[PDB]
Amino acid sequence: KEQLIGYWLAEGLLLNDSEKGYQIIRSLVSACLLQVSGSMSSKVKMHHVIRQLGLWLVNKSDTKFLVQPGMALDNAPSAEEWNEATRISIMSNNITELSFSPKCKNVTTLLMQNNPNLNKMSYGFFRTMSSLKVLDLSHTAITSLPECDALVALEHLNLSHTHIMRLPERLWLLKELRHLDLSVTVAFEDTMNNCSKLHKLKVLNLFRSHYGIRDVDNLNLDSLKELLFLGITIYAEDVLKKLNMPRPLAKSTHRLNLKYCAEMQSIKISDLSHMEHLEELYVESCYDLNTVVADAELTTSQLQFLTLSVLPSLESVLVAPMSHNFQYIRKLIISHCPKLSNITWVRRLQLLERLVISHCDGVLEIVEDTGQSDFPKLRLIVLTGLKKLRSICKAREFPCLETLRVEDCPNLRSIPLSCTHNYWKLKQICGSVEWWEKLQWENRKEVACLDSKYFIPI
Amino acid sequence: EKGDSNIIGVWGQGGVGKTTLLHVFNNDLEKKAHDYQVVIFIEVSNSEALNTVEIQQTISERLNLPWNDAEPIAKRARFLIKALGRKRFVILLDDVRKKFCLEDVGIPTPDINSQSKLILTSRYREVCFQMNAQRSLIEMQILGNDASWELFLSKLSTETSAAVEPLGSQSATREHAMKIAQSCGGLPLALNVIGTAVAGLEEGEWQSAADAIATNMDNIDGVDEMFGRLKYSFDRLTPTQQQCFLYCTLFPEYGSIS
Amino acid sequence: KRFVILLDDVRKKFCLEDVGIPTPDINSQSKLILTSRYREVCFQMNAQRSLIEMQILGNDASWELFLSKLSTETSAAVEPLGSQSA
Ligand SMILES: Nc1ncnc2c1ncn2[C@@H]1O[C@H](COP(=O)(O)OP(=O)(O)OP(=O)(O)O)[C@@H](O)[C@H]1O
């Protein structure tokens, strides 16, 4: 829903209110035009018959569409078909090169995501695109974006998972731009001091970026007072300290990234307590990280996504047992933390669903040795390469468990799975056969039923 | 029962249960014993032009009288005035909007010498005063917080209700429901419309829906018909009075003005 | 009378007493069944808690239904098992 509501907001169909987008999605699903489908309710889908009906309505409508998604197209259609349509979508294709320059005056929206083979575009491609409002180049292998100074109405950009190297200066000429998404940019090197040129921006994103705000010098977002959501990747403590003064800019960091951090041996949510909008936290490759502090101070912010990556020096995280900010946590991912040896506090997460762990060779158990199961909403646990994981946790009720995958865990002898729990929501279980045989079970029915109904050997 | 005046008037905001109160009262009269032979329910709000034929037909049907098509209205009015003159009747006018002569339709104005009681409802105090019911007047207070909350659950699915109903454990969804229920202001019709429109919540969007509903009520479904039902009271006022009313909306929400 | 009325594909909210159908209550044994393409209109009928979503038919059911709408000169060309054909 977040993507679709974003495009609706950029298209002008919504009066700068996302909740009306949620309401429209509700009207569609209640009319059975769309159906919610996914691990969480945040994902919906369109039925095949309804999709064909929509295409037929497009054909009968004056506003022609040129939409070819997911048919593995290796050669983009000629400019003749583009010149008359209004909305174009070529996502999930295998387009390699784009040479023609369209004459599309009436076209307002483009969708060219999920194109691994798309890396180069013809210059002057954007000259005729005066009416463009929504533009996406995500999940592609391009390196530069051609001249786009003729885009007098663009509002949305999304270059997530794109190997963009430098943002052209033509963007600062666009005063109508509203949304920028530049996450998972591994080749990005352009400075962000030039973003102060634009005035009417609402959203940025530097989450999990190769280049972010490494120092206070790069922090110049105070000019953009129109911002409501920002993505920032920290590389030094001074950025966090400069972010730690009361202003609307500080509280707008909804999701935070830590990459190649220097002098970040400790982090406290009290230092993050100035942020009332923080949910997601990502930490990757920080040498300093020794300890993480989760204070009992119940900040209004409701953290839900935590991911810790490549922290050989991270020893432990202190979580208050009685009351903690992690009670809202939806998902945990811990990767490459050989020195992390205190995670028992996971049992205090009543709202935890998804778990992914890889090569954290310091964790004995996710839970070592209210009147309810600690993980009633648990859905997914992933373990990989855990050399020192003796066990997962004690036996607990997981009525909503659906998927479990564990590989390369020689010390993992027992799992909290037991036949005393009801089994009607489980659908698949993954893992190696040798580890399944090496597991110690309290009841043999836990072996036969799982191995005959939902176990998927690798 | 205790009232010394045979005309009883009830007034209140549109859709605060006046019709519902009349329905429940009329249905509850059969439990208790009384000397009233006939209880008549009349819906006058069908028009502001006093569609007298429908009212006469309803009264005639309620008295086992043989309805006639070509009989003149005035003669029928006299006939029903004589007919109601020997029976202790309880007539329930619903949502009267302009002053009209009771003898014109055929309803005799009850006097202290008679045991008949007349009950009428309206959206306006002035029209109730025009019915000589200035001293059997009750203001229809809006429902309380507990009543509003218990009514709100009745218009929610359990897949949503069991997500909000449980106590003990504190979740943001319950507090969002507190915001939504209190935003309706205890007006039963507003609670019904919103609750029907919000019967389909899941956990994720409880926050945003509660955030927006406190500011803009247009986006939630079913409100256009609610406003149309409540639109008439504004339309009755003079254009100067209308302009004065819209000037009052600029003051802050949940405040007080001198 | 204890009645079972089957409304089919209701599309807008309408008063049951307007047409003449009394709204059944717990004190009565009458049951009212209605269908619609929209969840909202069903919620408007005070039936928010007797709601069932009509799931589409399964793959096996869809396949067995598909044969029922085919001629055997075509079906006997597709129905047989064992031998695999495009
Ligand atoms: N106590 C109550 N409990 C449940 N529903 C109620 C209650 N009071 C009123 N309602 C609802 O109010 C809705 C509107 O009818 P209501 O009696 O409130 O209108 P009204 O005050 O006569 O309106 P108007 O001024 O337009 O004539 C009904 O559908 C009924 O379900």
Strand order of the largest sheet of chain A: 11-12-14-16-18-19-20-21-22-23
Largest sheet of chain A: 10 strands, parallel
| Helix/strand/pairing category of chain A | alpha/beta
What is the assembly state of the chains in this entry?
part of a larger assembly
**Which word captures the global form of chain A?**
globular
H/E element sequence of chain A = HHEEHEHEEEEEEEEHEEEEEEEEEEEHHE
Q: Mind telling me the C-alpha Rg of chain A?
A: 24 Å
Which bin fits the share of residues in helices of chain A? 10-25%
Q: Summarize the largest interface: chains and residue counts.
A: A-B, 14 and 15 residues
* Beta-strand residue fraction of chain A: 15-25%
Put simply, the count of helices of chain A is 7
Give the beta-strand count of chain A. Answer: 23
Which ions, cofactors or small ligands are bound in this entry? adenosine-5'-triphosphate
- Distance between the ends of chain A: 33 Å
